[PDB]
Coordinates of C-alpha atoms in Angstrom, one line a residue:
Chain A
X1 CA 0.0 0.0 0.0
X2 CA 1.7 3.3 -1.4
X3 CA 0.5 6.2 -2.8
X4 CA 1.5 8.2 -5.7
X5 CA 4.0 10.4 -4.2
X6 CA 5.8 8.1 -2.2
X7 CA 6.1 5.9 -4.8
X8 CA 7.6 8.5 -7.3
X9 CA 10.4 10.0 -3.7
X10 CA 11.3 6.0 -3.9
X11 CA 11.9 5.9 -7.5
X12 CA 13.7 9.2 -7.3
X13 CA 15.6 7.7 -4.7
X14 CA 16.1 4.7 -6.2
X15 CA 17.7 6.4 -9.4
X16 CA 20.5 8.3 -7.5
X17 CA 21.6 4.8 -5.7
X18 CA 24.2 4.1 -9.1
X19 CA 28.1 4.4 -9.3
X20 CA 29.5 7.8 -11.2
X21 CA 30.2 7.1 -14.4
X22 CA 33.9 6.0 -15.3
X23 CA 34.7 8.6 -17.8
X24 CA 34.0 11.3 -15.6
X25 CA 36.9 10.7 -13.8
X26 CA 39.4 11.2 -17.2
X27 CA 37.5 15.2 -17.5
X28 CA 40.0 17.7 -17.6
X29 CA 38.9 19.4 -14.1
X30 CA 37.7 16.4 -12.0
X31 CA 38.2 16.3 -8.4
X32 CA 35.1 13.3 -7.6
X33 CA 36.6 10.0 -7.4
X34 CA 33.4 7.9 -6.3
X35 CA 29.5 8.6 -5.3
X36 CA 26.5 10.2 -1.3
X37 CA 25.7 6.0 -1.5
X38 CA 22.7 4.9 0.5
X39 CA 22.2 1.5 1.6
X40 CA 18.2 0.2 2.7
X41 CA 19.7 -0.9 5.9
X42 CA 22.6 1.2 6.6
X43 CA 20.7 4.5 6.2
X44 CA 16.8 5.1 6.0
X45 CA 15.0 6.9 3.8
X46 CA 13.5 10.4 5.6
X47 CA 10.2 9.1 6.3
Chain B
X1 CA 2.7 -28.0 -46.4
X2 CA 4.1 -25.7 -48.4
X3 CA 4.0 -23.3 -45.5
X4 CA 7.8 -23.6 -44.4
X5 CA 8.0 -21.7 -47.8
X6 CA 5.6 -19.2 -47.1
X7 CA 7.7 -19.2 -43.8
X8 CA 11.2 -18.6 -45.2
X9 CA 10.3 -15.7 -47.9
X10 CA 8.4 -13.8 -44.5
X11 CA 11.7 -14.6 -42.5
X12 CA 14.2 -12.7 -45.1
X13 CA 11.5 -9.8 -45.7
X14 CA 11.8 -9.4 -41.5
X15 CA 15.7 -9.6 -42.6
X16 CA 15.5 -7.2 -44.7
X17 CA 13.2 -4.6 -42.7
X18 CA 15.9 -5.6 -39.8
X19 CA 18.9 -5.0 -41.7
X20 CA 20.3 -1.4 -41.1
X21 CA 21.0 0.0 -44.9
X22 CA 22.5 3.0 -45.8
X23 CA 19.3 5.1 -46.8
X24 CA 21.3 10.4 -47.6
X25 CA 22.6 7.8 -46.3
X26 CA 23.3 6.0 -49.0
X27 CA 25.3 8.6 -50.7
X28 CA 27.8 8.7 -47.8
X29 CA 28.3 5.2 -46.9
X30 CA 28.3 4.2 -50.6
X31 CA 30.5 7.2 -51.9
X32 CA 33.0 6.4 -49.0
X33 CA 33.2 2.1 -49.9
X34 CA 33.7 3.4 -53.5
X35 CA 36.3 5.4 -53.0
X36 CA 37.6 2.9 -51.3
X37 CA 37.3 0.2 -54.0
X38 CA 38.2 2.2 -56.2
X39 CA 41.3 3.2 -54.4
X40 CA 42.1 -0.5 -54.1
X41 CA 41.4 -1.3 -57.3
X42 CA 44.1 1.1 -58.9
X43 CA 47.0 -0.7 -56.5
X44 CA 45.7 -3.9 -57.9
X45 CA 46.3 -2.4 -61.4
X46 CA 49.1 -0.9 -60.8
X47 CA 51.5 -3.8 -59.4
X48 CA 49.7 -6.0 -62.0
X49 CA 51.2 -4.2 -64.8
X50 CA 55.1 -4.3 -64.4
X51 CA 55.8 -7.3 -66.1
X52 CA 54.3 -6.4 -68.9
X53 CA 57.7 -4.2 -70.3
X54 CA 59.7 -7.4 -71.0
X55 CA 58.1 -7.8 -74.6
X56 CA 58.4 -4.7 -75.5
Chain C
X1 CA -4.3 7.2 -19.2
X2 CA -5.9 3.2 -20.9
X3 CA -7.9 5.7 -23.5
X4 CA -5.2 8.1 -24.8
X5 CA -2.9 5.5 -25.2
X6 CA -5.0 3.4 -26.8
X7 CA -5.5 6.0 -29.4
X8 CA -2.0 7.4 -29.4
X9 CA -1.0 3.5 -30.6
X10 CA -3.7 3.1 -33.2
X11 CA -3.0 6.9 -34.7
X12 CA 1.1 6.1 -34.5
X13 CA 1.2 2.6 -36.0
X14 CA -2.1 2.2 -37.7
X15 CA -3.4 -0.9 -36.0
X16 CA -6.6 -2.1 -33.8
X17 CA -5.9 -2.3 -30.0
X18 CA -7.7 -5.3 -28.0
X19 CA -7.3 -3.7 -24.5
X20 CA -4.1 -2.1 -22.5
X21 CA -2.9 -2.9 -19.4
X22 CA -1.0 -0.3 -17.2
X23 CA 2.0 -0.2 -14.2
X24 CA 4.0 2.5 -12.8
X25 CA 7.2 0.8 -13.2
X26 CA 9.6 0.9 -9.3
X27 CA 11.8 3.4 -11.5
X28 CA 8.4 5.8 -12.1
X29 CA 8.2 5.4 -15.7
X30 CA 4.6 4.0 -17.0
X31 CA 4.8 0.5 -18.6
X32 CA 1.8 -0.3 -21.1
X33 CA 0.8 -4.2 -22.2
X34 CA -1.2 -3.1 -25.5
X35 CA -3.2 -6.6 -26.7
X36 CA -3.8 -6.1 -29.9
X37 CA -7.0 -7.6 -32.1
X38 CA -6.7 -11.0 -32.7
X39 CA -6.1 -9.8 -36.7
X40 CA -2.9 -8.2 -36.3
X41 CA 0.2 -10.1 -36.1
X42 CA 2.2 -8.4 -33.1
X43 CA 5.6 -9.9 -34.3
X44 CA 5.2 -8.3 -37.4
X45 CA 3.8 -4.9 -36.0
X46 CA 6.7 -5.0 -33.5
X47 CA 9.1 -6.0 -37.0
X48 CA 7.4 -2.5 -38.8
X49 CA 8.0 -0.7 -35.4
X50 CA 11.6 -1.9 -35.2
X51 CA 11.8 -3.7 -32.5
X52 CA 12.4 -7.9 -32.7
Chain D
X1 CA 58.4 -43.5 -33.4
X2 CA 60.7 -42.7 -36.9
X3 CA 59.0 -39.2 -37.3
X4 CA 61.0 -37.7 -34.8
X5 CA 63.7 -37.2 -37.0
X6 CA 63.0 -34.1 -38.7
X7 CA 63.2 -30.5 -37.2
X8 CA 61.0 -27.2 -38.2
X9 CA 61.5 -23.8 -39.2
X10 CA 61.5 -20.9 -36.6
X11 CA 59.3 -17.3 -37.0
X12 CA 59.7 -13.9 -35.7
X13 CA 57.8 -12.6 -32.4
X14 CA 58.0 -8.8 -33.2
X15 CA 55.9 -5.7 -33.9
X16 CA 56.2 -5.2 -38.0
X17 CA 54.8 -2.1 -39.6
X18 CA 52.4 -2.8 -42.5
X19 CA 54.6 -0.8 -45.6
X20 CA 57.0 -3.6 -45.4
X21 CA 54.1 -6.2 -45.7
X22 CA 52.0 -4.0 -48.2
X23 CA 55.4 -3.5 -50.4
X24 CA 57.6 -6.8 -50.0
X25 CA 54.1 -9.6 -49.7
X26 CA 52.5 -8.2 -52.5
X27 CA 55.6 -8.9 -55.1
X28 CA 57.5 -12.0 -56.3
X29 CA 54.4 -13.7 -58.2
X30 CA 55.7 -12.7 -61.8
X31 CA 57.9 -15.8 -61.7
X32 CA 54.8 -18.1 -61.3
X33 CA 53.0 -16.0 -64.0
X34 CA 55.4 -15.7 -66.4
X35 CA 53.7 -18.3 -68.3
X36 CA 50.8 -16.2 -67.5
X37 CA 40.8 -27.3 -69.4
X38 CA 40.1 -23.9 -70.1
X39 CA 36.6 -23.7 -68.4
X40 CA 38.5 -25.9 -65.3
X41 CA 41.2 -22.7 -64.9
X42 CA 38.9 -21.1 -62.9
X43 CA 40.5 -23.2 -59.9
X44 CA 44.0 -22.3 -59.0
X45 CA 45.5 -21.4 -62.6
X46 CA 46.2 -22.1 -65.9
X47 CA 49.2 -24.3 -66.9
X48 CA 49.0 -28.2 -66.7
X49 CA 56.1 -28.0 -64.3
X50 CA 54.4 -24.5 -63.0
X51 CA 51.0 -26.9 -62.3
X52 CA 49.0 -24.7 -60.0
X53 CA 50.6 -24.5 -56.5
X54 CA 47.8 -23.2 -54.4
X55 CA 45.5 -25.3 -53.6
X56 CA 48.2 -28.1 -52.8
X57 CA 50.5 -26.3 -50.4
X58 CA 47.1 -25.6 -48.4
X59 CA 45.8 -28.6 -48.6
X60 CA 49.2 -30.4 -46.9
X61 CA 48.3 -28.3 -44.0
X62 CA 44.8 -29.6 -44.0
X63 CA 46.0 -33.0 -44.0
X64 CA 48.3 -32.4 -41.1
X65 CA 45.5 -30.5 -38.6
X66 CA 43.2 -33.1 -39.2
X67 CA 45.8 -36.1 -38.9
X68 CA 46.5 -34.2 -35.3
X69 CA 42.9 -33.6 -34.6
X70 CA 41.9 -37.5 -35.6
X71 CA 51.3 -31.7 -27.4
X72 CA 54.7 -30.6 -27.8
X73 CA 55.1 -34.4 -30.1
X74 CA 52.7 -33.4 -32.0
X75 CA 53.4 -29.8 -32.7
X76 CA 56.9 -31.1 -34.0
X77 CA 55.0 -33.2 -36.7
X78 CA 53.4 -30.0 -38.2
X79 CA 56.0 -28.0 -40.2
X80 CA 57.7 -31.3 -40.5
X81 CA 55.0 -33.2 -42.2
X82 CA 54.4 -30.9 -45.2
X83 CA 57.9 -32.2 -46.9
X84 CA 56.3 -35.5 -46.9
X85 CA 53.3 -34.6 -48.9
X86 CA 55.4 -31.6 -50.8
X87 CA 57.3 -34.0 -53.2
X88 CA 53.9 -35.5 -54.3
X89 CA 51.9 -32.7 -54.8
X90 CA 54.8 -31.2 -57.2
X91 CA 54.8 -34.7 -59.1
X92 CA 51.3 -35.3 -59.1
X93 CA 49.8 -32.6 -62.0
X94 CA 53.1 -33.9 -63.5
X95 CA 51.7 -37.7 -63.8
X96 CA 48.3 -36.4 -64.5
X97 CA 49.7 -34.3 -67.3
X98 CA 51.3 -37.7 -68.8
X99 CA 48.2 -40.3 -68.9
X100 CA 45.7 -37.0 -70.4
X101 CA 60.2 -41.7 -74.5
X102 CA 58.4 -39.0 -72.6
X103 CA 60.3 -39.6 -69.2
X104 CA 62.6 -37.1 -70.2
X105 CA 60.5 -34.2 -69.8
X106 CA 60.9 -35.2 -65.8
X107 CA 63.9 -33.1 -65.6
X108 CA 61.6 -29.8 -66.5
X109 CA 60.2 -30.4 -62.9
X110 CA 63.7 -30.3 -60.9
X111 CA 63.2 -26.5 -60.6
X112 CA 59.2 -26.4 -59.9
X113 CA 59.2 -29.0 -56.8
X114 CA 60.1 -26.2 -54.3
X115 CA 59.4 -22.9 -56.2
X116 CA 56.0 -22.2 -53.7
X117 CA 57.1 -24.6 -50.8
X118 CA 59.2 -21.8 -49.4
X119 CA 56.6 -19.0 -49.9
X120 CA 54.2 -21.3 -48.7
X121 CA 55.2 -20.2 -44.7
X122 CA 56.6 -17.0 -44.9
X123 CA 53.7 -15.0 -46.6
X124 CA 51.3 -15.9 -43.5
X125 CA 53.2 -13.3 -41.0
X126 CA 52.2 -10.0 -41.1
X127 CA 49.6 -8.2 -42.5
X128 CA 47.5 -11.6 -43.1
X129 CA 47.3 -11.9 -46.9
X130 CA 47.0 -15.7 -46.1
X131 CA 45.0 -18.9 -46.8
X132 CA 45.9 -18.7 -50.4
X133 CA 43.4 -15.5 -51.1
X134 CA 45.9 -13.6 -51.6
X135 CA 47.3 -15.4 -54.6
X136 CA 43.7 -15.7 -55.5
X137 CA 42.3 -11.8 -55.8
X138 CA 46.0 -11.2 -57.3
X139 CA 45.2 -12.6 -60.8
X140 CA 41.4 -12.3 -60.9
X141 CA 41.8 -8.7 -60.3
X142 CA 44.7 -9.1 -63.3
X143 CA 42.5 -10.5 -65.6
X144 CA 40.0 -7.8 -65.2
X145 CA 42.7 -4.2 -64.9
X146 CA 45.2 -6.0 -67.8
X147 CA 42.5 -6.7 -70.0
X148 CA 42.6 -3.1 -70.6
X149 CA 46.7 -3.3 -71.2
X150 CA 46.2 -6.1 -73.3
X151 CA 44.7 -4.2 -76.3
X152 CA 47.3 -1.8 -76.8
X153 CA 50.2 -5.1 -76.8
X154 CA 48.5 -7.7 -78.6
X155 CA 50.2 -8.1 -81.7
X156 CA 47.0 -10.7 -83.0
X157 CA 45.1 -8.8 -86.0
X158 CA 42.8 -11.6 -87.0
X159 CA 40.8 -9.7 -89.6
X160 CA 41.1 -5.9 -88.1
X161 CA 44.4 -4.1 -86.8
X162 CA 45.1 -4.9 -83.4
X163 CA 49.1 -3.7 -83.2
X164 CA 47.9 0.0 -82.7
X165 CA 45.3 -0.7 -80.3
X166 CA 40.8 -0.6 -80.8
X167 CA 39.6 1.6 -78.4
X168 CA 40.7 4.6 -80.4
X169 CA 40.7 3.7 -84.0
X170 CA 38.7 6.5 -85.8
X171 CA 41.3 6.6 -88.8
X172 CA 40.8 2.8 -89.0
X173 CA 37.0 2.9 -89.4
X174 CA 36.7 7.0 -90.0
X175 CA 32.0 6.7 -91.2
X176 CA 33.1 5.2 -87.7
X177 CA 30.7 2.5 -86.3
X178 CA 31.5 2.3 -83.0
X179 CA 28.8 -0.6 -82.4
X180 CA 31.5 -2.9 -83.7
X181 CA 31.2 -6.5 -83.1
X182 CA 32.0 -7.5 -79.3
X183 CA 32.8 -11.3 -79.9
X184 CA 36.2 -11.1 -79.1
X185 CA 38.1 -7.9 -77.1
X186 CA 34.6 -6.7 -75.7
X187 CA 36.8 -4.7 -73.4
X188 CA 34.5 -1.4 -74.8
X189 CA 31.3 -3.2 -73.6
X190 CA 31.9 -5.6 -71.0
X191 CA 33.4 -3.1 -68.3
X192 CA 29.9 -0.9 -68.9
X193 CA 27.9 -4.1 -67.6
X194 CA 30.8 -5.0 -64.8
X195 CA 30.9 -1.2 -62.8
X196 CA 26.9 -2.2 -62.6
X197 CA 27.8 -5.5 -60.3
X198 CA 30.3 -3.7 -58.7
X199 CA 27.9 -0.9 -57.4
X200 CA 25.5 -3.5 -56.6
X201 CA 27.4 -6.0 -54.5
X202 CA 29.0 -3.4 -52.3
X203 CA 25.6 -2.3 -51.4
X204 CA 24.3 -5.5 -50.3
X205 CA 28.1 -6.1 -48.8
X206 CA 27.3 -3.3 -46.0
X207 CA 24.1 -5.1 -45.0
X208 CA 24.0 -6.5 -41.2
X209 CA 21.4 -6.8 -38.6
X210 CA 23.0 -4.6 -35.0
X211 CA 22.4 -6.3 -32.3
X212 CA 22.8 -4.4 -28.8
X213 CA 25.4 -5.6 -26.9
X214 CA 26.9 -5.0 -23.7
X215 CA 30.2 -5.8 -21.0
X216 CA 28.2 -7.7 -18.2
X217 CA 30.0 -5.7 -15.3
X218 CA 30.7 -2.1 -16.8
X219 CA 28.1 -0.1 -16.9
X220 CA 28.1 2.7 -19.9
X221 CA 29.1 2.4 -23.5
X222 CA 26.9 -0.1 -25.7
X223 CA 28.5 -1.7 -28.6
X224 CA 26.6 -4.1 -31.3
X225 CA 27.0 -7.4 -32.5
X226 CA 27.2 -7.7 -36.3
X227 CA 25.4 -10.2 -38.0
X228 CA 25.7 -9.2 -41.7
X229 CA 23.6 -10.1 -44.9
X230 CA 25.8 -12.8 -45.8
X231 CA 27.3 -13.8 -42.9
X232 CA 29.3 -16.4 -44.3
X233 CA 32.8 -15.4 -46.2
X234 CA 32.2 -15.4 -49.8
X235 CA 35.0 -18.4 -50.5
X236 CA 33.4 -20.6 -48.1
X237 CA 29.9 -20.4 -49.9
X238 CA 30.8 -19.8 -53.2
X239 CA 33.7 -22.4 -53.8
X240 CA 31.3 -25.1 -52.3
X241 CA 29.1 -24.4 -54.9
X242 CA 32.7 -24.1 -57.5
X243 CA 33.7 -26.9 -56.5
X244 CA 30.5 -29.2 -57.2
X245 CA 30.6 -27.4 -61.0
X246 CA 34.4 -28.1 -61.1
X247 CA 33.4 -32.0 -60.2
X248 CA 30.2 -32.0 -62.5
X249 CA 32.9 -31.2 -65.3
X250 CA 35.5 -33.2 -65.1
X251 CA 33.3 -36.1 -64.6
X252 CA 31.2 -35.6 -67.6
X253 CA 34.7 -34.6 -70.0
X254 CA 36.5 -38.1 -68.2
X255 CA 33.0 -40.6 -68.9
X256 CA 30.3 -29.0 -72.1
X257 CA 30.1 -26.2 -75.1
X258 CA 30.6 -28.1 -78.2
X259 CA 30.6 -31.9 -79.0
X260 CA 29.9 -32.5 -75.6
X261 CA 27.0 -33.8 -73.6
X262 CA 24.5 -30.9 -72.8
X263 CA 22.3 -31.8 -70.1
X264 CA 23.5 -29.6 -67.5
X265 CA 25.0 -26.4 -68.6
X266 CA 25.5 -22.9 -67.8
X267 CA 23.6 -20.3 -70.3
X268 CA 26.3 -18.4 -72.2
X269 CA 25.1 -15.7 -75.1
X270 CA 25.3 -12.0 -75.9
X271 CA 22.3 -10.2 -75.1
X272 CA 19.4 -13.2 -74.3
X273 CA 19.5 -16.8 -75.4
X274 CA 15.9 -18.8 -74.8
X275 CA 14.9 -22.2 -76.8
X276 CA 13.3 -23.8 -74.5
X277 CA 13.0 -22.7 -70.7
X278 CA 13.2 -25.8 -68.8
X279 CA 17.3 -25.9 -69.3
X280 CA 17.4 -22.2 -68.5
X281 CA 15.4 -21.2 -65.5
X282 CA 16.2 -24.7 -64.1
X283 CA 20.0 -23.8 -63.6
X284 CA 19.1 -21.0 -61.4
X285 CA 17.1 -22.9 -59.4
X286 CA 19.5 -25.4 -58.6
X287 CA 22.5 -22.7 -58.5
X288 CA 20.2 -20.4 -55.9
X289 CA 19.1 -23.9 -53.7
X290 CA 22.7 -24.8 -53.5
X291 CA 24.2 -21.9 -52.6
X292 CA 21.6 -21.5 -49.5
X293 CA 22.3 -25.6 -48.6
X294 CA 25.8 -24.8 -48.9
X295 CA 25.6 -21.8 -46.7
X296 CA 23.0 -23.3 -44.5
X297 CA 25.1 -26.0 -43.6
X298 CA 28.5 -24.4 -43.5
X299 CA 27.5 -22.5 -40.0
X300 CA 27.0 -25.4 -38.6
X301 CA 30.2 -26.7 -39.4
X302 CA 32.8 -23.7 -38.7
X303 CA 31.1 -22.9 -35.0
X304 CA 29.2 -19.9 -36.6
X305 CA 26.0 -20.8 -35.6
X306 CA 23.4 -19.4 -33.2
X307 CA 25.0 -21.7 -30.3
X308 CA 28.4 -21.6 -30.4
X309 CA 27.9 -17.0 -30.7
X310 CA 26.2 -17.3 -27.2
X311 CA 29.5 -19.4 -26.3
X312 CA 31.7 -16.8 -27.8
X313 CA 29.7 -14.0 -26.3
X314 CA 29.6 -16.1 -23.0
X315 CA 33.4 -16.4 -23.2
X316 CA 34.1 -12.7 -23.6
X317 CA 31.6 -11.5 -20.9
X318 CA 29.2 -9.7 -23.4
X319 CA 25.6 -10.2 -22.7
X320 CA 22.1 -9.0 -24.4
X321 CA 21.3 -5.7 -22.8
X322 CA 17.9 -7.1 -20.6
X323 CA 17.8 -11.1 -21.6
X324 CA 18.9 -13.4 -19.7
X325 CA 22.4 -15.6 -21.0
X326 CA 19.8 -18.3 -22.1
X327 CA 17.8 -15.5 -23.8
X328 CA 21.4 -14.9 -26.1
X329 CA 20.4 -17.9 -28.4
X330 CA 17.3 -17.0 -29.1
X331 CA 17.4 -13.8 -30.4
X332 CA 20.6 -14.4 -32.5
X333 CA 18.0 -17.6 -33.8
X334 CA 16.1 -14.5 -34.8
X335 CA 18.5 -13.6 -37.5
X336 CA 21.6 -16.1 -37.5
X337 CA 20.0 -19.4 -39.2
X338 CA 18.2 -17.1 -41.6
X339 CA 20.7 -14.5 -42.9
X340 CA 22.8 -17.7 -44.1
X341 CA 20.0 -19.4 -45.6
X342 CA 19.0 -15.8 -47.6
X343 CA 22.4 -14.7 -47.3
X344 CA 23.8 -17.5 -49.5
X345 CA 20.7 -17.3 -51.5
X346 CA 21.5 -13.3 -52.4
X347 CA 25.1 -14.0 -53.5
X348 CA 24.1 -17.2 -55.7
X349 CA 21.4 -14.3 -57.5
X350 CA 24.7 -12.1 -57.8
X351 CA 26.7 -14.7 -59.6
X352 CA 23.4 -15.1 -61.5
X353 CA 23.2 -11.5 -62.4
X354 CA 26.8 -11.3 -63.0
X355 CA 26.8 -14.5 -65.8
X356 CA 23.8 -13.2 -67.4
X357 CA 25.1 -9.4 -67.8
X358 CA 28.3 -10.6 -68.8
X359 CA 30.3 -8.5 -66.7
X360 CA 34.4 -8.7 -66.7
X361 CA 36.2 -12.3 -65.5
X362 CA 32.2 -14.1 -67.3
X363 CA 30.3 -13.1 -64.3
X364 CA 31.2 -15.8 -61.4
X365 CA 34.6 -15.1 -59.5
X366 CA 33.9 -11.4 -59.3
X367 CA 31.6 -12.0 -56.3
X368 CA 34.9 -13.6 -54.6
X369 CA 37.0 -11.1 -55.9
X370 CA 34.7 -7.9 -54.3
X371 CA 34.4 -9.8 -50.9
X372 CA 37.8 -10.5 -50.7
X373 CA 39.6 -7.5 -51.0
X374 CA 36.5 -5.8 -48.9
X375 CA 37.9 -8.2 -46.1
X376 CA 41.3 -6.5 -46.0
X377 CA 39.3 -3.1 -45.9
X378 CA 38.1 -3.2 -42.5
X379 CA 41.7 -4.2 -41.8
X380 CA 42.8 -0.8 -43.6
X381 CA 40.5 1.4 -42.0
X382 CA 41.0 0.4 -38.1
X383 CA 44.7 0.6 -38.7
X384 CA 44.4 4.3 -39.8
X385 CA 42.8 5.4 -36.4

């Protein structure tokens, strides 16, 4: 049982839970070497 | 029982609408392999025709 | 929504729909099943369509 | 236990750059053509000491992977074993040229019995102009660019002037009727109908289905699998198919254009030649089935089918971009087992198309000839960033 909104902060979530891309780290300025990770268990969701 | 037939002929039109051809296209990927060819074609005549001197 | 894409489908690819199914996908994007009438050959739709 | 008496031959282990191989591999063939069963010539060349050379020093290796596929012992009875077979392949056109005091002319073969076994190893390394192709594409393609050459050197007059050449001869005929008669030099009609095929094949060269692919732990770039049109190399499909003609002739000339049984025969004729349909339209039939049996079956031969792909792919940790590894078989089923069977079907109507236009080299070969040095292209191109 969800409704609309939570659903699409979950997906949102969901979608920023990937690696950085690899070829970011060859740009010509780039300081980030890996990704603000969230694990289900190690961190919860502000809700 | 024919069918496998009318099977076969279908498969190579779904080929065929599968297959990625060069379409403006065309003029670019088929200009570039003639060149090429072409290109090829004039070092094939070329060291073909050295032997030729020794009658005349 | 079931109607507009029902429409939408028929208008785009010129084919009958039999019904359409909906889901809001875990990523947010809407997934439609689109049956289509019994006439129409979906492995050749989805071959004009570009897909399969 | 008394072949391990014999050593082999050693080869280098170092970066070469490709002018040496493009400038010293492409030379030293004048020797075997300086002599430069007509219909049969087709095969590997023309003389019957010189022989032909190609398909023999390939086929020794042949014999020797399969004799080891029937290991540091074995790998010393590879380079060793061709000497064994090298004496008979030399002395075997010799005898055949005997049967159809004469034992004299034996001496004419001292030179000839290890003219090509030395090329035979050397010309692999490199740039790959291997597997006898090479030799192949180097005097089809002569046939076709000397034929123009040849007009302006042949000395033969027949009934017209030839010593000055035919392509330009308005103070010969100038009124001028350039419609002469094309049965013999058709060089000013023949390479009209050939730049058609050549057009034509390349087009249907460049056809492939892409299939998405992707490294099963990076995530990022997509690359595609390419299936192409023919998906079989031309010489596997279109020899097989050579070959059986090759046999069909020899067979009928041992137990056909003149004083010669007729039943199967390729049509041959400027322009159209119909009498009756059923000889006609029957050899395509049987040329086109062939040629998709012969393709058909070759994938599953050479580990090109469906199956062994998803091995390969498998193997090299590529994977379909949401099926499963099972799920790899049966799309490539989607196109694999049918682009061979229509594939092979498509170059068979080539050669068709080729023979009855008329084109340069009599229509059939020029499909091997375009494919060929199209192979050595894609080489040529990744090279050059």
């Amino acid at each position: 049982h969800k409704t609309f909104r939570i659903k699409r902060f979950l997906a949102k979530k969901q979608k920023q839970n990937r690696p950085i891309p690899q070829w970011i780290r060859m740009k010509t300025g780039n300081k980030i070497r890996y990704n603000k990770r969230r694990h289900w268990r190690r961190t919860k969701l502000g809700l | 029982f024919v069918e496998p037939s009318r099977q076969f002929v279908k498969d190579s039109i779904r080929l065929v609408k599968r297959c990625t051809k060069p379409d403006k296209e065309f003029q670019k990927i088929a200009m570039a392999t003639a060149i090429g060819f072409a290109i090829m074609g004039f070092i094939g005549f070329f060291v073909k025709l050295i032997h030729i001197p020794i009658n005349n | 929504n079931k109607h507009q894409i029902k429409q939408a489908v028929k208008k785009l690819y010129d084919i009958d729909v039999a019904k359409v199914n909906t889901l809001i996908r875990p990523d947010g994007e809407k997934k439609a099943y689109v049956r289509l009438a019994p006439d129409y050959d979906a492995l050749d739709v989805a071959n004009k369509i570009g897909i399969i | 236990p008394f072949c391990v008496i014999l050593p082999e031959i050693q080869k280098p282990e170092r970066k070469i750059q490709f002018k040496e191989k493009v400038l010293w591999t492409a030379i030293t063939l004048f020797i075997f053509l300086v002599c430069c069963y007509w219909m049969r010539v087709i095969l590997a060349s023309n003389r019957g000491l010189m022989a032909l050379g190609i398909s023999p020093i390939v086929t020794s290796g042949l014999i020797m992977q399969l004799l080891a596929g029937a290991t540091p012992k074995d790998r010393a009875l590879f380079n060793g074993a061709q000497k064994l077979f090298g004496m008979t392949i030399t002395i075997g056109q010799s005898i055949v040229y005997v049967m159809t005091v004469c034992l004299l002319i034996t001496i004419q073969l001292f030179v000839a019995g290890l003219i090509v076994l030395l090329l035979d190893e050397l010309l692999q390394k490199g740039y790959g102009l291997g597997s006898g192709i090479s030799l192949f594409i180097a005097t089809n393609i002569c046939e076709t660019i000397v034929w123009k050459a040849f007009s302006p050197t042949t000395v033969n007059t027949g009934r017209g002037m030839e010593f000055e050449g035919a392509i330009i001869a308005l103070f010969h005929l100038l009124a001028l009727r350039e419609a002469f008669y094309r049965q013999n030099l058709p060089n000013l009609m023949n390479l009209i109908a050939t730049i058609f095929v050549f057009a034509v094949v390349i087009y249907f060269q460049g056809f492939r289905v892409d299939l998405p692919i992707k490294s099963a732990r990076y995530r990022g770039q997509y690359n595609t699998y390419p299936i192409k049109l023919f998906y079989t190399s031309n010489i596997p499909i279109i020899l097989q198919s050579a070959l059986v003609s090759n046999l069909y002739v020899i067979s009928q000339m041992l137990s056909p254009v003149g004083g010669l049984c007729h039943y199967l025969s390729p049509p041959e004729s400027f322009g159209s030649v119909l009498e009756d349909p059923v000889h006609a339209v029957v050899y395509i039939v049987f040329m086109l089935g062939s040629c998709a049996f012969f393709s058909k079956t070759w994938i599953e031969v050479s580990g090109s089918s469906a199956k062994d792909v998803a091995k390969q792919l498998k193997e090299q940790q590529m994977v379909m971009r949401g099926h499963r590894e099972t799920s790899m078989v049966h799309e490539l089923n989607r196109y694999i087992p049918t682009a061979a069977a229509f594939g092979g079907l498509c170059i068979g109507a080539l050669s068709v198309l080729a023979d009855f236009l008329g084109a340069i080299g009599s229509g059939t070969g020029i499909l091997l000839a375009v494919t060929i040095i199209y192979q050595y292209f894609e080489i040529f191109v990744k090279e050059q960033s």
